[PDB]
Symmetry: D2
Subunit: 257 residues, 4 copies
């Protein structure tokens, strides 16, 4: 009952982290609108979960997002939380093999989708004293190899969260982000499958955390429910869900030349 009577929109909710967030909010007593550009996972998740419904919506298409918000209000009468999870991490990219246009397209997906839904939702979040939860990444904070465009998008989302938190604080709307590290999801599995030795890639991903495993969508989901339902004095924070990957020395490459 932690979030009973509340209405939550989760983008990219059809699989992976987003589906974990959907499940966590349903378990907390909320009604959830699952947004995804792909029907397959999200439609099944509506059938499975009483209290969740699915709306086909590509966050890069502003009229899809306008309809997502208007339909949420028409069907459920209020909006308390938006979780901006839709996004993508490309395969490894050497800097010289990226392009400005590819970078613009990744910004469109990973940064401007979040911007667009947040802007359309905010009038309703002000009415409910609701909150925004943005998914970013640990790599926005610490960098990553072979991911210049992706890392830039994560740095932008984390910073944008802080700016919007300042702007919406007089209106009672909190804005926070979750920065996952390595979470085992279909995207992780798909990216590993492109590598010459998928098994070694997965093992390396596990051992990047002091805990020696990757995280689960359910763990990101619990962090989101905390931010929405109980973190009433938290705004503009970056909640790390990383298993300690940012801690200590690790293998990153006369002794001093």
């Amino acid at each position: 009952t932690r979030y009973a009577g509340k209405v939550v929109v989760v983008t990219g909710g059809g699989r992976g982290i987003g589906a974990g967030i959907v499940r966590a909010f349903v378990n907390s007593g909320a009604r959830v609108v699952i947004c995804d550009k792909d029907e397959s996972g999200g439609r099944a998740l509506e059938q499975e979960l009483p209290g969740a419904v699915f709306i086909l919506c590509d966050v890069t298409q502003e009229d899809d997002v306008k309809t997502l918000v208007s339909e949420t209000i028409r069907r459920f009468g209020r909006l308390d939380c938006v979780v901006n999870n839709a996004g993508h991490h490309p395969p490894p990219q050497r800097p010289e093999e990226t392009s400005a246009q590819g970078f613009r397209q990744l910004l469109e997906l990973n940064l401007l989708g979040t911007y667009t839904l947040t802007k359309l939702a905010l009038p309703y979040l002000r009415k409910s004293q609701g909150n925004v939860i943005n998914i970013s990444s640990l790599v926005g904070a610490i960098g990553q190899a072979q991911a210049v465009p992706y890392v830039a998008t994560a740095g932008a989302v984390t910073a944008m969260t802080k700016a919007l938190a300042l702007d919406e604080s007089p209106y009672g709307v909190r804005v926070n982000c979750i920065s996952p590290g390595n979470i085992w999801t279909p995207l992780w599995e798909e990216l590993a499958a492109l590598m010459p030795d998928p098994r070694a890639s997965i093992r390396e991903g596990m051992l990047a955390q002091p805990l020696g495993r990757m995280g689960q969508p359910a763990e990101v989901g619990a962090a989101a429910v905390f931010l929405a339902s109980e973190a009433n004095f938290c705004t503009g924070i970056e909640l790390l869900v990383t298993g300690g990957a940012e801690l200590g020395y690790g293998c990153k490459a006369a002794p001093d030349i």
Copy 2:
């Protein structure tokens, strides 16, 4: 039922933040041992709360802490979480009006109490796959005026949390910290009362947050319950409970000379 069947020790649990943490854990279904050097608040809190008991214990006295742990195990059979909250913030201190011996004494209270209880508890936390929650302060991260010794103690606790998280990760024990900013507590009230204009001091404390208010012990308590019960992929994190005080420009003091 989020933390049902678990046993939690909260130091400095007799009033303020610590009492808020005690209440949050009892509400989650845990049994709580309240440690405090003062009988007054903690004894009343035992009488009030089914599931909480009080043990008189000064965290700077190592034999008090040894008995705290042995009595917790004797009475309740397990130990799942220690919350190291006991500590003190002095009134404003100009750097030249501090002393090395006063600094040692503040380290003894604010840093070594945490160290001692954590060390004595860890064998039992390993058995239960339990966790450590250290209270630090935002000022460890950003500094504060007229508080050189206090700020150093907070910086030490936050860093120590990360080191111990690394060391205990192979044993399944998570170690995290909460960094509050301005939380309205008896200590805040007592410190304000020493100022020439207590009301103006309190108002300044409120306006240090974009949210325009101070936080509550219950809000720190909810963050602690999250870290203990649901943050299974979080270790070595610093969870800010600060109302946005670290965000944006504020009043800190030709245009460029």
Copy 3:
């Protein structure tokens, strides 16, 4: 003679921070190519400074940037350092008064100009074991009010710096950023002049630093010369030139409701 025999490109070098960086590098013994979209300041700066020349170049126009690099190599025979300073901070913008297209255009200027010049320069920087210096902003790290798009661009630049530092480390090319806070420049003066009380805006900008003043272009310039010429074990750092603005509590807005 700290950077004698070296060749440096500074974008937005015609006034403000960029001109301060140009002057610092000339004083260190380097030859400097001043890039700016405006002829006025940069042309005068070429006439003033032996060792600096001016090339008209808008960093958002990829063929301008290609010619900037090819002309630098044709005229001077090597390239050791690029300083990505060109960019803009808009006047205050409420979140609901921004647009996705305006945000894309600010990303084009503040993020993709840096990306484009860096990509074109890197083959030459690899030959010279040179380095990249990106100008970002403190507000990328801490947020700012009424600046969602700008803050996002700064967060992106700082993060991108870290990613590229990782990628170029095996090739001996360091990539660092400087995050200024409040630096007194023509842009600061122009923005203040748009406010209802310019004098009060300037005073507030000065008092945002514990030092009680804004910084100077020459101070950013000295930080850039350090990063280029002497910081041989620094890569992926964010060097704050902020006068302490990020430190301590300040004015950001019952006591706890």
Copy 4:
């Protein structure tokens, strides 16, 4: 001539990082007082360097430090910069194999020496508008395995730097810190020699940086000269001299259990 006419005290200046800092300041034109508890290296360094002198002084002995300051003023007439470098990193320590008394002793050396010299020097630094440079460590920020006491001391020094920067800002005295990562020094060599495979320990230390090498005392020295002589708008900063060790994923330890 960058720091000509200035007087600098460097503690632990007889070897390692401290000796690199001494050399950098002498090369900048300053007169340097080398403090060390051991005569061997520091006495030789006085004979070698015109402009450096050696004073035997253990920073944990407050009367040694009082005499260090009084002798500096008696002999040279002013004091412009103190570099608090003296300290020690123990061999690896499991948390359960540390003691409160050992922790107090390490705090005495690594934190309170810095506190004591800074306090005694500050009246003279106010007269000269001088500055304080504290050596800390990257591990204060990110943690390290098998080093709970050391990490706590580094976290304390970094935080203390920020607090004192706030307090001394109205008096024109800047206070900054340098956080080295892995610097090849006699201490590093001695610690490696205690390991079962010293060569493998050294190689692991080198590969902890994306740059693939450890840093040099001269590189820390150049950072110190920058902070003293040219960083006039920097106060309360943590200048990382780490070769990128904090960046990206590395080896820190079903895929998600």
